Amino acid sequence: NEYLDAKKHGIDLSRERAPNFVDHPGIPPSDCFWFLYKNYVRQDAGVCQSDWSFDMKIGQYWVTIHTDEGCRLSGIIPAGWLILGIKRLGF
Amino acid sequence: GPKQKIVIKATMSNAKSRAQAMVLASKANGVGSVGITGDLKDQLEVVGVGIDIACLVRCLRKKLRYAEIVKVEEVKDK
């Protein structure tokens, strides 16, 4: 587990401030929040769709992030960075 | 049919420059919707099909000095 490890450095996703985002008209709302940390410090946050994937630029690096049915995130991300997912509250 | 959610990061540090970016993005062909995102509100997400993103990034890069694509997610239907 890597939530277990985050929790050692004081990261709790259940008590992070929600990302800034919009629910766009005409498409399903995103049901996952992602939080992005460098050397364990929050740099950014956003939303994504469960049981899916997205591409994101982290520093110099384009990365593919896989999002499983429970908003767990996986992918090869650059050294020093950590990305963590959780169900959007009420999803 | 397929639609993309595309996040562009740009130099927007106030409501005025954020507003200008949203208006410019809203006028681009294929843009169905646009919203501010990011911990520093330095990102806009556009949603649509047939968006000329190269052109949209070019127009924003001219207006704001720095703009680049930083996230692409396909819309997951239903």
Numbering used by the authors:
A (entry chain B): 23 to 113
B (entry chain A): 1 to 78
Show sentences the authors wrote.
Here, we unravelled the biochemical and structural basis of adaptive evolution of APikL2, an exceptionally conserved paralog of the well-studied rice-lineage specific effector AVR-Pik. Whereas AVR-Pik and other members of the six-gene AVR-Pik family show specific patterns of presence/absence polymorphisms between grass-specific lineages of M. oryzae, APikL2 stands out by being ubiquitously present in all blast fungus lineages from 13 different host species. Using biochemical, biophysical and structural biology methods, we show that a single aspartate to asparagine polymorphism expands the binding spectrum of APikL2 to host proteins of the heavy-metal associated (HMA) domain family. The structures were solved and refined as described in the Materials and Methods. In each case, the APikL2 variants and HMAs form 1:1 complexes, with both displaying the same global fold and interaction interfaces as previously described for the interaction of AVR-Pik with the Pik-1 integrated HMA domains.
